[PDB]
């Protein structure tokens, strides 16, 4: 009965850096922050982009995507009402393919945040995604898609 | 087990695959592992006498 | 590519929307969301053949691939476009790279494997048992691309070794070590699997003890 | 028996503060030199850069 109602395979979160929030009619998937940090923290005043895919669960729609702002002054450049039984892809997660060189509606609703607060990858940061149907807190992480290891200074024995 | 699950529209205690394994192994046990052997059980029992 | 994305979309539509709901959002308590898993994850799961999965068990097992390379790539591209994530390595021609993923260094690959992989798989990539109905599959079958993409994306109950944990150089090294251990003949005679103590003990108690006791019966006399 | 320590659901915790290690004491006093020279002043070492701002 390892394949009973409590099976390991069915209850498996995707092996992705982003977090998934199911609260509300719209479901949030692959929620994370692209924020290349060159030091201990990401200093306030630097724009870091917020990636997520919003899926409208019901076909009857919560396409509003009102504010989705938190501490950091979230800004939705190229805002649009994308969700209609379809993905709302705010940005371009590392590895995302631009299907065509031309972009419809300019940037596909790219979300950016001015930190106003130090952040370092490996932490949980709350972002209150507000939709017309409801609002949800996500505790967004920081994700680095494919940027290889930055060369650490070689150690001098002492 | 299958019948207790089937008395209710919901899945009270059997997962879909658990119930499927249940009817599979039940049919196989009761055809190929109870009946086709017990015919030969009765054979060995009485046919040499008969 | 547009046609590639269309083909991947249609195959996804007729194969897995039942558990990775249309729009790639995972169905609750049937399958995870694929947004962000990336093209590497699809290549790995669908090429191993685990991914058109047909049960919830302790672990989804590897099985003959239900798709071929071109439409494997179609599914991977569809998932990548929807979510965006890691990409499978490829060679100059454009196909999935196999020989290029065999790192030159193998002793370094050996150390990396033993510290990281052998934990659950084996000394030499054989299997290992996990908590409850889970296990680490044998690495003899996996091809270099499959090993690389398995390290890149933790399929299930496997740590996800990002490109930063194991630099592509280190992943090529580990792939080379896995292939070398898989295809290297066992010196000293028939390798009783890769597990030493258990196969050797069983081989003793069967071969050597049956031979010895049979010779004792032949030389000796029953009475 | 169970070990005495056990769980703590209360006091969820705080994010670890950025580590700032203390200088190595007289025992491991050996450290990289900052530069040697005559230094006929309050002290400048053998390394002193400057940035030109417009
Ligand atoms: C490979 C290695 C070489 C194999 C060939 C060597 C001998 C095999 C013949 C088997 C019969 C036998 O030994 O008796 C004849 C005879 C013994 O007769 P006896 O002691 O003078 O009087 C016997 C009485 O009739 C009293 O006998 P009984 O009526 O009480 O029952 C006789 C027989 C009846 O019980 C049986 O087990 C009979 C089945 C014999 C077939 C075995 C081979 C099957 C092939 C499968 C793969 C094997 C590997 O039992 C045995 O004597 C067999 C004992 C152990 C089985 C030997 C092979 C296993 O021995 C020989 O002809 C030479 C024996 C040489 C010693 C080696 C025996 C063990 C080697 C097997 C190693 C297995 C793993 C290695 C890889
Ligand atoms: C053992 C005994 C007669 C005790 C008498 C009463 C007594 C003193 C009790 C107090 C001691 C206690 C507390 C005992 C409980 C637990 C215990 C036995 C602990 C001691 C263990 C020990 C040091 C020795 C016991 C070993 C023993 C006598 C084994 C049986 C030997 C025989 C005659 C086996 C059959 C002959 C034969 C053809 C064997 C080969 C065929 C096969 C495959 C047999 C099964 C088999 C075996 C037997 C393996 O050992 C084995 C090891 C690793 C991998 C696989 C196998 C395996 O498949
Ligand atoms: C009695 C003395 C005679 C001993 C035999 C001597 C024969 C010498 C053989 C030839 C030279 C040495 C071969 C060394 C190369 C070699 O080892 O041989 C493998 C095969 O191995 C297998 O599969 C098993 C095949 C089945 C036949 C052998 C079975 C004999 C057993 C039964 C004897 C012990 C008794 C145990 C009793 C059991 C129960 C009784 C109550 C073959 O390759 P392969 O198949 O591909 O191995 C896979 C890697 O590739 C891949 O990565 C790796 O990941 C793996 O998948 C690996 O298997
Ligand atoms: C429930 C049946 C089921 C169906 C059918 C199915 N999946 Fe999934 N999928 C799962 C489960 C369960 C997992 C995670 C555990 C596993 O993979 O065994 C998963 C995980 C994945 C992963 C890897 C996730 C990760 O983080 O590594 C990918 C990629 C994927 N699925 C894509 C697909 C594709 C492509 C198809 C169609 C070829 C498909 N799935 C069909 C259930 C399913
Ligand atoms: C227990 C922790 C764990 C460790 C650590 C681990 N693995 Fe795995 N590995 C697994 C599990 C569990 C699977 C099964 C994945 C599945 O069934 O979807 C697996 C699958 C694989 C596969 C797929 C083989 C096949 O036939 O499907 C390969 C190749 C592999 N691992 C290699 C590695 C390498 C290389 C490392 C070192 C970077 C490693 N493993 C470290 C547990 C682990
Ligand atoms: C005390 C000893 C005497 C026993 C007395 C009566 C003993 C009476 C035993 C009632 C057993 C009731 C079953 C309840 C199962 C269940 O719902 O629990 C859920 C669990 C989580 O599900 C599972 O995980 C798998 C459970 C599957 C059990 C397969 C057993 C198959 C045995 C075969 C491998 C053959 C072995 C040979 C055995 C040969 C036996 C010959 C008699
Ligand atoms: C998961 O590990 C197994 C799922 C199977 C659940 C249904 C079991 C049906 C009962 C089988 C009877 C076994 C023999 C009973 C001996 C008395």
PDB file of N, CA and C in Angstrom, chain C residues 190-221:
ATOM      1  N   UNK C 190      33.695 -12.985 -13.149  1.00  0.00           N
ATOM      2  CA  UNK C 190      32.325 -12.504 -13.234  1.00  0.00           C
ATOM      3  C   UNK C 190      31.977 -11.668 -12.012  1.00  0.00           C
ATOM      4  N   UNK C 191      31.759 -10.374 -12.212  1.00  0.00           N
ATOM      5  CA  UNK C 191      31.327  -9.517 -11.130  1.00  0.00           C
ATOM      6  C   UNK C 191      29.924  -9.859 -10.684  1.00  0.00           C
ATOM      7  N   UNK C 192      29.786 -10.380  -9.466  1.00  0.00           N
ATOM      8  CA  UNK C 192      28.483 -10.777  -8.937  1.00  0.00           C
ATOM      9  C   UNK C 192      27.710  -9.503  -8.616  1.00  0.00           C
ATOM     10  N   UNK C 193      27.108  -8.929  -9.651  1.00  0.00           N
ATOM     11  CA  UNK C 193      26.555  -7.606  -9.489  1.00  0.00           C
ATOM     12  C   UNK C 193      27.665  -6.622  -9.174  1.00  0.00           C
ATOM     13  N   UNK C 194      27.304  -5.556  -8.470  1.00  0.00           N
ATOM     14  CA  UNK C 194      28.287  -4.607  -7.990  1.00  0.00           C
ATOM     15  C   UNK C 194      28.382  -4.648  -6.483  1.00  0.00           C
ATOM     16  N   UNK C 195      27.319  -5.131  -5.850  1.00  0.00           N
ATOM     17  CA  UNK C 195      27.298  -5.287  -4.404  1.00  0.00           C
ATOM     18  C   UNK C 195      28.246  -6.409  -4.015  1.00  0.00           C
ATOM     19  N   UNK C 196      29.216  -6.109  -3.163  1.00  0.00           N
ATOM     20  CA  UNK C 196      30.184  -7.109  -2.804  1.00  0.00           C
ATOM     21  C   UNK C 196      29.648  -8.130  -1.823  1.00  0.00           C
ATOM     22  N   UNK C 197      29.437  -7.717  -0.577  1.00  0.00           N
ATOM     23  CA  UNK C 197      29.216  -8.715   0.483  1.00  0.00           C
ATOM     24  C   UNK C 197      28.072  -9.680   0.212  1.00  0.00           C
ATOM     25  N   UNK C 198      26.948  -9.203  -0.317  1.00  0.00           N
ATOM     26  CA  UNK C 198      25.768 -10.051  -0.442  1.00  0.00           C
ATOM     27  C   UNK C 198      25.884 -11.010  -1.622  1.00  0.00           C
ATOM     28  N   UNK C 199      26.130 -10.525  -2.841  1.00  0.00           N
ATOM     29  CA  UNK C 199      26.383 -11.469  -3.938  1.00  0.00           C
ATOM     30  C   UNK C 199      27.536 -12.421  -3.677  1.00  0.00           C
ATOM     31  N   UNK C 200      28.640 -11.961  -3.081  1.00  0.00           N
ATOM     32  CA  UNK C 200      29.743 -12.879  -2.794  1.00  0.00           C
ATOM     33  C   UNK C 200      29.352 -13.924  -1.757  1.00  0.00           C
ATOM     34  N   UNK C 201      28.644 -13.526  -0.700  1.00  0.00           N
ATOM     35  CA  UNK C 201      28.215 -14.508   0.281  1.00  0.00           C
ATOM     36  C   UNK C 201      27.256 -15.524  -0.307  1.00  0.00           C
ATOM     37  N   UNK C 202      26.300 -15.055  -1.108  1.00  0.00           N
ATOM     38  CA  UNK C 202      25.359 -15.961  -1.752  1.00  0.00           C
ATOM     39  C   UNK C 202      26.079 -16.896  -2.711  1.00  0.00           C
ATOM     40  N   UNK C 203      27.039 -16.367  -3.474  1.00  0.00           N
ATOM     41  CA  UNK C 203      27.804 -17.191  -4.399  1.00  0.00           C
ATOM     42  C   UNK C 203      28.615 -18.234  -3.656  1.00  0.00           C
ATOM     43  N   UNK C 204      29.240 -17.855  -2.544  1.00  0.00           N
ATOM     44  CA  UNK C 204      29.905 -18.848  -1.713  1.00  0.00           C
ATOM     45  C   UNK C 204      28.927 -19.942  -1.324  1.00  0.00           C
ATOM     46  N   UNK C 205      27.880 -19.571  -0.587  1.00  0.00           N
ATOM     47  CA  UNK C 205      26.982 -20.569  -0.021  1.00  0.00           C
ATOM     48  C   UNK C 205      26.337 -21.439  -1.089  1.00  0.00           C
ATOM     49  N   UNK C 206      26.189 -20.942  -2.316  1.00  0.00           N
ATOM     50  CA  UNK C 206      25.635 -21.796  -3.359  1.00  0.00           C
ATOM     51  C   UNK C 206      26.757 -22.587  -4.012  1.00  0.00           C
ATOM     52  N   UNK C 207      27.632 -21.908  -4.752  1.00  0.00           N
ATOM     53  CA  UNK C 207      28.616 -22.608  -5.568  1.00  0.00           C
ATOM     54  C   UNK C 207      29.581 -23.387  -4.686  1.00  0.00           C
ATOM     55  N   UNK C 208      30.312 -22.684  -3.820  1.00  0.00           N
ATOM     56  CA  UNK C 208      31.389 -23.332  -3.097  1.00  0.00           C
ATOM     57  C   UNK C 208      30.889 -24.385  -2.131  1.00  0.00           C
ATOM     58  N   UNK C 209      29.823 -24.080  -1.391  1.00  0.00           N
ATOM     59  CA  UNK C 209      29.318 -25.036  -0.411  1.00  0.00           C
ATOM     60  C   UNK C 209      28.595 -26.205  -1.069  1.00  0.00           C
ATOM     61  N   UNK C 210      27.840 -25.974  -2.145  1.00  0.00           N
ATOM     62  CA  UNK C 210      27.247 -27.104  -2.847  1.00  0.00           C
ATOM     63  C   UNK C 210      28.342 -28.002  -3.401  1.00  0.00           C
ATOM     64  N   UNK C 211      29.382 -27.411  -3.993  1.00  0.00           N
ATOM     65  CA  UNK C 211      30.477 -28.215  -4.522  1.00  0.00           C
ATOM     66  C   UNK C 211      31.170 -28.991  -3.411  1.00  0.00           C
ATOM     67  N   UNK C 212      31.475 -28.321  -2.298  1.00  0.00           N
ATOM     68  CA  UNK C 212      32.191 -28.977  -1.213  1.00  0.00           C
ATOM     69  C   UNK C 212      31.367 -30.099  -0.603  1.00  0.00           C
ATOM     70  N   UNK C 213      30.078 -29.860  -0.362  1.00  0.00           N
ATOM     71  CA  UNK C 213      29.250 -30.875   0.275  1.00  0.00           C
ATOM     72  C   UNK C 213      28.970 -32.021  -0.689  1.00  0.00           C
ATOM     73  N   UNK C 214      28.808 -31.723  -1.979  1.00  0.00           N
ATOM     74  CA  UNK C 214      28.656 -32.789  -2.951  1.00  0.00           C
ATOM     75  C   UNK C 214      29.904 -33.640  -3.065  1.00  0.00           C
ATOM     76  N   UNK C 215      31.076 -33.009  -3.008  1.00  0.00           N
ATOM     77  CA  UNK C 215      32.318 -33.771  -3.020  1.00  0.00           C
ATOM     78  C   UNK C 215      32.447 -34.590  -1.745  1.00  0.00           C
ATOM     79  N   UNK C 216      31.989 -34.046  -0.616  1.00  0.00           N
ATOM     80  CA  UNK C 216      32.008 -34.806   0.628  1.00  0.00           C
ATOM     81  C   UNK C 216      31.107 -36.028   0.535  1.00  0.00           C
ATOM     82  N   UNK C 217      29.929 -35.871  -0.068  1.00  0.00           N
ATOM     83  CA  UNK C 217      29.041 -37.010  -0.271  1.00  0.00           C
ATOM     84  C   UNK C 217      29.666 -38.031  -1.210  1.00  0.00           C
ATOM     85  N   UNK C 218      30.303 -37.560  -2.280  1.00  0.00           N
ATOM     86  CA  UNK C 218      30.929 -38.471  -3.230  1.00  0.00           C
ATOM     87  C   UNK C 218      32.053 -39.258  -2.570  1.00  0.00           C
ATOM     88  N   UNK C 219      32.945 -38.561  -1.869  1.00  0.00           N
ATOM     89  CA  UNK C 219      34.041 -39.226  -1.177  1.00  0.00           C
ATOM     90  C   UNK C 219      33.520 -40.003   0.022  1.00  0.00           C
ATOM     91  N   UNK C 220      32.597 -39.410   0.775  1.00  0.00           N
ATOM     92  CA  UNK C 220      32.059 -40.043   1.955  1.00  0.00           C
ATOM     93  C   UNK C 220      31.022 -41.092   1.621  1.00  0.00           C
ATOM     94  N   UNK C 221      30.450 -41.664   2.676  1.00  0.00           N
ATOM     95  CA  UNK C 221      29.476 -42.738   2.553  1.00  0.00           C
ATOM     96  C   UNK C 221      28.257 -42.417   3.399  1.00  0.00           C
TER      97      UNK C 221
END
